[PDB]
Structures are given as C-alpha cells and as structure tokens.
Design a protein around this ligand. Structure first.
Ligand SMILES: N#Cc1ccc(OCCCN2CCC([C@@](O)(c3cccc(F)c3)C3CCCC3)CC2)cc1
Length: 468
C-alpha cells in the first residue's frame, strides 16, 4: 500500500526489529517484496557501505522507508500503463513482462561496474540507479507485484535469473543480462537453453520461486562485505537470523543454495541449538535430489568447501567427485563459463594444494592419510571422469594440456601400491568410468612411475608427439 498493518513495527531499531518485520510480512497473504528489499538495502547501506556515525544499528524510520517506497511505486506506475496490456485469466502477457523489464533497464545508469557489491537491492536501484544482473530480475518481480501481477515470479538457476509467468505459470521470459559480452535475449523464453542441456538452464531443473522463496532470495542476496578483509558482524547476524526464520517456516525446503549459505554462516558462528553445518549442507543436497532431479552442482561444492577448510581430504574429494557426477550429464555450452572456472580451480589449484599438504604430513608420519586410502584415489579418478564425460558431446571442449600437468602431479601423490588397489570395473574400492577418456587411461593409472606424456595424450586426445 503501504497498508496500515505494514507500518506498525516502525521504527526498526535493531536486527531483531528487522526480523520482526520479515516475520510479519511472511505471515501475510503476500509478503511485500518492495518493502523488504528497501529495508535490507537501507540497513546494508548504513552497515557496509557507509558506517560513518554508526553507533549500534541504523534506525529505519517509517518516513524514510515510506518515501523510498513511494519513489519506486511512482516510477513503476507512471511508466507501465496496465490498460495497454489487458490481463485475461488474471495472468500477465509477455508484452507486459517485457515492458516492466524495459522500465527497470532504462532507469539504470548508463555506465557502472556491474559486479560491484551492494547493488542488489531496490535501495540501490532508487538511490544509485544501479543494479547487478540478478538484481534486475528481482526488481522486475517486485515491480510486477506492486502492479498486482500475482503470476509473475522469479526463476533462478545456479548462475542466472529470469521470470516465470502466464497461464499456469508456464511461460518463461529473460528480463536481465547474463555474463559479460553475451548479447541480450530479453523477452525470449529459456527453451533453447534448456534444450541444449547447458548448465546455465539446468536442463529445466531451475527454481520457480513463490513469494516466500523470493524473500529467501533477497536474504541470500544480503552482502555483509565492508571490504576485502572485513565483514559486517551486524549484517552476518541479520542474514543468519532471517535464514533461520525462513527455514523454520519451511521456505528453504526447495532452496538448496540458501541452505548452503546458512551452513556457511553457521560454520562461521554457530547458533546454539541448531543443526551443524554438515547437517545443513546435506539438507541442501537432499533438497536438490528431491525437487531438482539432483541436477545442481553447488550443493556438493558447498559441502566440499567445508571439508576442504576443515582438511577432511577424503570427504572433500568425495564431494568434488559428486559435483563431477552431476556435471557429466550436461553439455558444456557457451555461457557456462562460471562452472568451468569452478571446476578448473578445484582441479588445478585446490586439490593440488590439499594433496601437497597431505604429502608433507605423510612424510611426517601421518596415519589414515587420504594419500594411503584407495577410496580417496577413487574419488579423484571419479572427479576427472565426470569432467571428461561432461566434455563428450559438448559444442566446446573442456580439457586441455594445462589440466594435464596437474592431473599427472595429483595422480603421483598417491603411491603405486595405493593406486593398484582401486578396481576399475566395466559396464558391462571399485569404480566404473563413464568417460571414454578415463577408460583409456586405465592402463596407466597403476604404474609405479606415472607415464606423464601418455597421460597428457589421453586426457587431451592430442594425438601426436614432437617431430624432432
Ligand atoms: N569447493 C568449493 C566451492 C566452490 C564454489 C562455491 O560457491 C558457493 C557460492 C555459490 N554462489 C552461486 C551464485 C549465487 C548468486 O550469484 C546467484 C544465484 C542464483 C542466480 C544468480 F543469477 C546469482 C547470488 C544468490 C543471491 C544473490 C545472487 C551466489 C552463491 C562453494 C564451494
């Protein structure tokens, strides 16, 4: 409206007052996305962007928040004339969705750094005329709610955002950009991307948010970073509390990434009486298995990251193998470059550093070392197998000789007597390879001294050696 009942908790004088507001909105028919995003952006501004004069919490006065809200609703109502776009069935049309998208887009500053922090919220849109990529999609959904368009909802993959709308909520529309230097498909469906089996569209197993899940998104979007070295404890606490509220009300049930975020926040600062981070990462993975065909990568990455930081090398390797086991059933497409980077860093930086330390610890007499555990070698092999299988049938290759050097080094961290204990079984520790590259590498995986040149040839399917 704002409606009288939405105004009664103001002023918000603390983290807990903001939690109160979220609880009240989540108990309504429809939580007010515009109100909530403006409040988070206000408090994030004064806790992370400009802390000058801060003494405890930046009090959110109704007059201030109501005037920002009025700025937003005036901008959207003035620019989108609904009479031009009749709604039959009480559902929206593609032209209406595109118009709202255009209005948001056309309001943005002509030039700014798109991956800056703190440009995710409606506070940023109103006060700075700046939004990040997914922020634009969220703003479209907020604007649509403000206009009464109950059918328009946020859609989220692991690296992009768009909307769903229309009869049965079955239509899709691009509303925002993706990446850097990919050309807009604003207004179009996501069906080509789904059909090509790219990671970006998750084979169709992407989140279709309800209003509560859109609240969860804006909560995950909070950015406690003050600078590279420093997070706002106040924003960490607020995000954590808001995620527990959502969790308790059931609104994280279908939101794997949110459960990973909450697990990471609990690792940093555990809440007494709550599930441990590991339980939460596993809930994230179970959510992806239950609702999204186990076609998400980040539930496993989140888990691997935790094990890595805790130097549980076996369990980290297991979880990265599981990431690869998901990616293997995708085609590597243009605009998947974020997940390629993730896999590259794991294979070529993280795993090497971990195994380097494990090697030094083994020299110092360690027992139960991953490097002496054939099931850990099997995980390493399953990780490469999934990456090789991913590559098969993709329009663009994945592996190159730069990966080969690290593979050879990583393999060699395990002694031959350990590697010999993995049984590689064919269809039709034990491991089955899905990729042709690893099936052909079987021959070389158990020699005392790894034949480096042969491994390079097999991984990159470079077929010739130097002439002279
Ligand atoms: N090992 C390991 C490891 C590697 C990577 C990793 O990533 C964890 C964080 C994943 N990241 C995925 C993208 C995501 C995010 O950019 C995102 C999510 C979905 C769609 C979208 F367009 C953007 C933010 C979610 C709230 C505001 C945008 C933010 C979180 C965690 C562990």
């Amino acid at each position: 409206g704002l409606k009288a009942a939405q105004k009664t908790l103001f002023p918000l004088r603390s983290i807990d007052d903001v939690v109160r507001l979220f609880a009240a909105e989540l108990g309504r028919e429809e939580p007010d996305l515009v109100l909530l995003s403006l409040v988070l952006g206000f408090v994030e501004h004064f806790l992370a962007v400009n802390r000058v004069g801060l003494t405890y919490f930046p009090v959110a006065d109704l007059s201030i928040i109501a005037a920002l809200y009025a700025r937003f609703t005036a901008q959207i109502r003035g620019a989108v004339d609904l009479s031009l776009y009749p709604r039959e069935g009480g559902v929206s049309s593609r032209e209406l969705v595109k118009k709202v998208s255009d209005v948001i887009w056309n309001s943005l500053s002509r030039s700014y750094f798109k991956d800056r922090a703190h440009i995710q919220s409606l506070f940023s849109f109103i006060t700075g005329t700046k939004l990040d990529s997914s922020g634009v999609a969220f703003a479209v959904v907020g604007a649509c709610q403000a206009l009464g368009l109950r059918d328009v909802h946020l859609a989220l993959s692991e690296d992009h955002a768009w909307v769903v709308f229309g009869p049965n909520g079955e239509q899709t529309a691009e509303v925002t950009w993706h990446g850097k230097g990919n050309e807009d498909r604003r207004g179009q469906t996501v069906n080509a991307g789904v059909a090509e089996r790219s990671w970006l569209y998750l084979k169709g197993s992407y989140m279709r948010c309800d209003r509560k899940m859109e609240v969860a998104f804006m909560v995950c979007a909070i950015n406690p970073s003050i600078d590279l070295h420093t997070d706002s404890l106040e924003l960490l606490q607020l995000q954590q509390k808001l995620l527990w509220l959502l969790y308790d009300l059931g609104h994280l049930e279908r939101y794997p990434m949110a459960l990973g975020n909450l697990a990471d926040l609990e690792e940093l600062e555990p809440t007494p009486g709550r599930p441990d981070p590991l339980t939460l990462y596993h809930k994230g993975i179970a959510s992806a298995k239950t609702y999204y065909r186990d076609e998400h990568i980040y539930p496993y990455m989140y888990l691997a990251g935790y094990h890595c930081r805790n130097r549980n090398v076996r369990e980290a390797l297991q979880a990265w193998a599981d990431t690869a086991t998901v990616i293997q059933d995708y085609n590597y497409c243009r605009e998947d470059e974020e997940i390629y980077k993730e896999f590259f860093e794991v294979a070529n930086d993280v795993i090497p550093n971990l195994l380097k330390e494990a090697a030094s610890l083994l020299e110092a007499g360690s027992q139960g070392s991953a490097l002496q555990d054939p099931e850990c070698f099997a995980h390493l092999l399953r990780f490469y197998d999934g990456i090789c299988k991913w590559e098969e049938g993709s329009p663009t290759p994945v592996l190159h000789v730069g990966w080969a050097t690290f593979l050879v080094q990583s393999l060699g961290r395990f002694e031959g007597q350990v590697r010999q204990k993995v049984r590689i079984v064919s269809v039709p520790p034990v491991l089955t390879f899905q990729s042709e590259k690893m099936k052909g590498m079987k021959e070389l995986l158990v020699a005392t001294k790894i034949n480096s040149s042969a491994i390079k040839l097999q991984l990159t399917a470079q077929s010739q050696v130097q002439m002279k």
